[PDB]
Amino acid sequence: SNAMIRCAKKEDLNAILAIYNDAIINTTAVYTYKPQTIDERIAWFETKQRNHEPIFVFEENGSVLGFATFGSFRPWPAYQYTIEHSIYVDASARGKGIASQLLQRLIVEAKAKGYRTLVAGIDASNEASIKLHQKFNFKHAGTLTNVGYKFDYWLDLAFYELDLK
Amino acid sequence: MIRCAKKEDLNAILAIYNDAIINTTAVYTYKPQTIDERIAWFETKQRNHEPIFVFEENGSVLGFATFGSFRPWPAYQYTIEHSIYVDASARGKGIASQLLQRLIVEAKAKGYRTLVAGIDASNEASIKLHQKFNFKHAGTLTNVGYKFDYWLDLAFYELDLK
Amino acid sequence: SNAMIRCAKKEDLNAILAIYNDAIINTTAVYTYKPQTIDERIAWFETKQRNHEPIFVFEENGSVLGFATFGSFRPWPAYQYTIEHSIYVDASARGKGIASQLLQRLIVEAKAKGYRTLVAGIDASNEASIKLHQKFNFKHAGTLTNVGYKFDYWLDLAFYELDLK
Amino acid sequence: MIRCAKKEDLNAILAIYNDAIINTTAVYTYKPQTIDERIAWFETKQRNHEPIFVFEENGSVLGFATFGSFRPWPAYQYTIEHSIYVDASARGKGIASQLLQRLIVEAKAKGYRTLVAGIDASNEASIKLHQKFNFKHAGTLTNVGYKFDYWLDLAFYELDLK
Structure with a gap:
């Protein structure tokens, strides 16, 4: 039972790709329709x-x-x-508590880099994710209704936020 | 008259925009835009x-007004x-109201479902205007911006176009 | 500016009544239609x-x-x-931060009496109350839709909960 | 047959109920009910x-089934x-399903809008049954109950009767 959270490397990308594409094909966790390609994923990594x-x-x-990352919220x-x-x-x-361990690591990195505010866009249907975020003291900041469309139904995007200060 | 913008409008537009950058929280940007960036934006x-x-x-x-992508997926x-x-x-002069009205008309004509405004929580006139056009307050993200040495809250307002 | 939070006394009831009845007449803060009488309020106090x-x-x-109280959540x-x-x-x-001071006092009393779980039923429209509860680390536990009817529209009741442990 | 309960049913009902009190989290009560309390409940x-x-x-x-007030306002x-x-x-034997079906029929006939179930989060059969009848999980209150030396979570499930 050799378990570890580490920074991702290039040799991880294929695994990462699979995970991401599964999410694209079966869930509303990614507001995307088409599977991502390995070149797109490599460009993303670079x-x-x-x-x-x-x-x-x-x-x-x-x-x-599992994998996890953060980046820009809005481009300004x-x-x-x-x-x-x-x-x-x-x-x-x-x-297995993998999401929880990843979020924990994200938060420690966010604090160490001096950010103020960490935002999650979570589909209103993603109950496990919402519960996980509430556990880490994210506050529901709002819900944009009918912002997405997938699997022939309208999707609501909830924003959860953590004050890192 | 409200009409579509032309390249010849760009300078004026730039001025308006830069004023908003320099004096208000209406644009989450610090430095003035240059005419080259504005022209690229237009094209x-x-x-x-x-x-x-x-x-x-x-x-x-x-005044000027536009719409585009909300999130890129x-x-x-x-x-x-x-x-x-x-x-x-x-x-x-009721300019913002006439522009919003025109935007909503254009948004319906193009078959969009949802129109979103990111409004700074302190912009009370904009909030009142959007309430007037039946936008719903969808939520508020606190401390998402930083300008003029203080933390900024962004209110999201939404209109169902159906 | 002589300000204080204290336990209520009988001589407070009239003031309390007014506040309550205002809420009944103008808001969805009380799922009641008719103003309460002073005898009903006195019986409540006793x-x-x-x-x-x-x-x-x-x-x-x-x-x-302002006033505030707690009691049974469900009768079992x-x-x-x-x-x-x-x-x-x-x-x-x-x-004026009166709601906040009252909630703070409620929480200290709840902890001192050894309760485990503090529940708020908040109308989904009551934004200030929701924000206040989030501030004190209540978690949104759910929303019952169309459970109430007042002012000719259907009402949704949100439950917020604080783990007092 | 599913019929309305009569006083002569009460003893049997009591037994069922008390079994649930003694052995399960289906009733948030500790002590057995007495036939007097049950009769008062019936009347x-x-x-x-x-x-x-x-x-x-x-x-x-x-089996037996009933409905009544959810909250008292x-x-x-x-x-x-x-x-x-x-x-x-x-x-x-599909008894709970037949009872739920009958309850829903009765609830619609009497003009109710919303039917609510408080289901213990561990009662998986009840949850599956209510999902089958199109109830929506409205939420879960954690640590709201205490029985058999552990903390109990109550899931709320709701059906829009319209």
């Missing part, structure tokens, strides 16, 4: 590396079972102390 | 077929975020 | 006294500007460590 | 015109909370 944005993976028994200079994060856990690996 | 919007409207009176552009397809800016010397 | 349930008032310059013996509270502030006295 | 429900249904088979009451007028109890020896 861009995160250039921007000094973290990517963490949860790895167990040689397998990447005065949002500089605000970041938005995302967390994805393999569907075969749920119930 | 990009022409390319994306996003509308830009100006309010013109006595040959002078007194494909499933946000039917959601747009709008922006309105009115010349500081042209307040009180 | 009952709270018999049950050792607290009633606090915020008093300033000789005037009761196994809910004994759970209480539900309510807070009412005079409409002429809003924005 | 009170007759008075309030609240329905009580029993599932009867081979002359034996194998006038504006909760169109909301009811229901309860279903099935004999422990009569599980697997």
Whole structure:
């Protein structure tokens, strides 16, 4: 039972890709329709590396079972102390507290880099994610109704926020 | 008259925008925009077929308005975020209201479902205006911005276009 | 500026009544239609006294500007460590932090009496109350839709909860 | 057969109820009910015109069900909370489902808007049953109950009767 949270590396990308694409195909966790390609994912990784944005993976028994990152919330200079994060856990690996460990690590990194405000965009249907965020003292800041459309129904996006100060 | 913006409008638009940058929390930016960035913005919007409207009176552009993507993921397809800016010397004339009205007309015509405004929590006139046009307060993100040495709260207001 | 939070007394009831009835007439803060009578309010007070349930008032310059209490959440013996509270502030006295001071006092009393769980039933429209409760680390536990009917529209009741442990 | 309960049913009902008190988290009560309290409950429900249904088979009451007030304030007028109890020896027979079906029929006929179930978070069969009848999980209150030396979570499930 060799389990560890570490920064992601290039050799992780394929695993990461699979996880992400599963989420695209089966859930509203990603407001995307088409599976991402490996080149798109590699460009994403290189861009995160250039921007000094973290990517963490949860790895167990040689397998990447989850990943997490943060970056810009809205693209305007005065949002500089605000970041938005995302967390994805393999569907075969749920119930193991992997999301919780990833979020914990994200928060420690966010505090160490001096950000003020951490934002989660969570689909209103994502009950486990909402519960997890409430556990870490995120406050529900609002809900934008009918902002998304997927699987033939309208989607509501809830914003949760943590004051890192 | 409210008409679509043309390249010849750009300088005036820039001025309005930069005033808002320098003096208000209406734009979460610190440094003035340059005319080159504005021109690039214009051409990009022409390319994306996003509308830009100006309010013109006595040959002078007194306000402008536009809408575009709210968040950049494909499933946000039917959601747009709008922006309105009115010349500081042209307040009180109902310009922002006429622009918002025009934006809403354009948004319905193009088949969008949801129109979103990010309004600074202190912009009470804008809030009152959007309430008047039946926008609902969707929420408020606190301390999301930082300008003029203080923390800024962003209120989200939404209109269902259906 | 003589301001104080104290336990309520009989001589407070008239003031309390007015506040309550204002809330009945103008808001969804009380799922009641008809104004309460002074005898009903006195019976309420006597009952709270018999049950050792607290009633606090915020008093300033000789005037009761707010009141607050807690009691049973659901009537079955196994809910004994759970209480539900309510807070009412005079409409002429809003924005003074009176609700916040009352809630603070309620929480200290709840902890001192060994309860585990404090519950707020808040109308989904009551934004100030929701914000106040989030401030004191209540978690939104759920929302019952169309449970109430008042002023010709359907009402949603949100539950917020604080773990007192 | 599912019929309205009669006084002669009460003893059987009591047994069922008390079993649930003694062995499960289905009733947030510690001590067995007495037949006097049950009779008072029955007469009170007759008075309030609240329905009580029993599932009867081979002359034996194998389950019962009822609904009544959810919260005690006038504006909760169109909301009811229901309860279903099935004999422990009569599980697997679809009794709870037939009772719920009957309750829903009765609730619509009487013009209620919202039907509410308080279900212990560990009662997975009840949850699955209510999901089957299109109840929505409205929320969960954690640590609201205490029984058998542990903390209990109450899930609320709701059906819009319109």
